[PDB]
Design brief:
The structure is a homodimer.
Chain A: H1 4-13, H2 28-48, H3 54-68, E1 72-74, E2 79-81, H4 83-87, E3 102-103, E4 107-109, H5 114-124, E5 132-141, E6 153-162, H6 168-182, E7 187-189, E8 192-197, E9 200-208, E10 222-228, H7 229-237, E11 251-252, E12 255-256
Helix pairs in contact in A: 1-2
Bound molecules: phosphoaminophosphonic acid-adenylate ester (ANP) (2 copies), (2R)-2-azanyl-3-[3-(trifluoromethyl)phenyl]propanoic acid (2 copies) and magnesium ion (MG) (4 copies).
PDB class: ligase
Keywords: tRNA Synthetase, ligase
Assembly: dimeric
Chain lengths: ~260, ~260
């Protein structure tokens, strides 16, 4: 009989498409040696052929989708003024107020893309024709309890359109084309809306105007959404724990690096 | 005569390829209105045609170069254990010890890619054939004095090869092909080596083994280098201040967003 500690070790080496059973009559050492051989082989094939990181490749694939749909690619600061958090309405009564990674006295690691996207919408409205379509992909940070669906360091896609054409129908059409392009099953549940894969939230989306817009100098309708890239990878590759998709020293494209 | 404050404002709106002179006999308001029209036009052309961010596009171009040369694309944590800094030999007698952005009690924003690349080399040596070639591109953080060549939030390319073929000649060949591919003039000065554009350091490169390797479980020869992406963009686009190439709310592809 395998110990719990031994089964934990084998599950680190198990990939979703393996057809091995750990309740066999086979000893630990031989199940471990079999899985180690498979995972080394998996890494050798990546190294010999594609050599691309899942998280990097997904960001590039999403970038192409949105650029091709007419959205401007934004790269904005990850380390942001702490004042942005309060100005987002994130006060002490919100869960999120307790999740902020503070840096020095007046800064923090951004937990979301919305402040920077608001600022870009306001500034670009002085220069670009209506409607204004922008998106950003990059690191975001939140303190979280341990859990199979949460990382403290993750990657968010955020997109926003401002001006004409900002209807819930158009928002759902973007989400639907996007996820059908990536090959990810979803349901939209609902002006706020969540994009669900079973019980897992892939995105929260919204339709403006909302009262918060005024604090950011925004006074036009808008639609937008935010997606976690590691949650998309978790669903696409059927990972049991989102740690397999993270920026990590422990996994490469979902393969354990502790071999 | 323009005030100093007015000339500062015009220089925000000036792009390197403009052929306007601010020592003309033209009033500020009309020089400002001319430049504002040009910069709005520049943003409209980006939005209508390419829509890609300089920093994102450069990262994708560098990724293709290194993947095509046989290097594995790594995406590792930006928020790293504080212990990694000391283990890199960064003690109190180094400038860098005073430049760390600490987060909570045991973490920091990485100021370099070397700790994570060392860890990946050690782990992948159990699985991949010799030689092991890896690279990473992503955010790095250092407290800096104000200066036209430094950002507190920047983007570093780091690459490393371990095992056979780790000669200074091979290292210089990688650097030379890389920068000739990007179209960036350089000189290599020198086992340590710096890649210079005039007085600007584009890269520091190195040849192992070195004594530090043992602390990271490394005992094979290696070559590698680290490049700042914003410095590469600064040189390529002839920006006067690296702020024009940064993750920013103030500039988009070097164009002022304050129009
Ligand atoms: N800690 C996290 N790790 C990974 N992805 C995350 C994390 N927090 C948020 N996301 C993703 O970012 C998207 C937009 O952020 P947000 O709607 O604020 O998440 P959320 O409401 O906190 N979801 P949840 O924490 O699971 O109830 C979410 O739909 C997730 O896909
Ligand atoms: N603050 C910064 N802003 C932008 N790029 C940077 C910064 N610090 C380092 N880099 C880049 O990262 C590369 C590798 O890091 P490193 O060799 O440690 O820089 P460095 O020695 O501090 N150069 P410098 O600070 O100008 O004397 C450098 O060659 C630069 O191109
Ligand atoms: N669901 C969002 C993610 C998000 C990204 C970009 C824009 C927006 C917008 F303001 F459009 F809703 C949201 C969050 O975490 O705030
Ligand atoms: N010049 C380096 C940048 C760097 C990146 C990746 C690897 C390495 C290596 F360990 F190869 F030298 C260095 C620094 O800042 O440490
Ligand atoms: Mg949450
Ligand atoms: Mg949500
Ligand atoms: Mg320095
Ligand atoms: Mg240096």
């Amino acid at each position: 009989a395998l110990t719990k500690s031994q089964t934990d070790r084998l599950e680190v080496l198990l990939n979703p498409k393996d057809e091995i059973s750990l309740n066999s009559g086979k000893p630990f050492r031989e199940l471990e040696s079999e899985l180690l051989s498979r995972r080394k082989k998996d890494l050798q094939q990546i190294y010999a052929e594609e050599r691309e990181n899942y998280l990097g490749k997904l960001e590039r694939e999403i970038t192409r989708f949105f650029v091709d749909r007419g959205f401007l690619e934004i790269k904005s600061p990850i380390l942001i003024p702490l004042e942005y958090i309060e100005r987002m309405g994130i006060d002490n009564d919100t869960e999120l107020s307790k999740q902020i990674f503070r840096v020095d006295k007046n800064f923090c690691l951004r937990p979301m893309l919305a402040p920077n996207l608001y600022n870009y919408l306001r500034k670009l409205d002085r220069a670009l024709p209506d409607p204004i379509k922008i998106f950003e992909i990059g690191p975001c940070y939140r303190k979280e309890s341990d859990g199979k669906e949460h990382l403290e360091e993750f990657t968010m896609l955020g997109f926003q359109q401002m001006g004409s054409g900002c209807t819930r129908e158009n928002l759902e059409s973007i989400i639907t084309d996007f996820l059908n392009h990536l090959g990810i099953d979803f349901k939209i549940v609902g002006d706020t809306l969540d994009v669900m894969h079973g019980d897992l939230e892939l995105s929260s989306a919204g339709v403006g105007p909302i009262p918060l817009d005024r604090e950011w100098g925004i006074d036009k309708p808008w639609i937008g959404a935010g997606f976690g890239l590691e949650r998309l990878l978790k669903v696409k590759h059927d990972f049991k724990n989102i740690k397999r998709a993270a920026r990590s020293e422990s996994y490469y494209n979902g393969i354990s690096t502790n071999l």
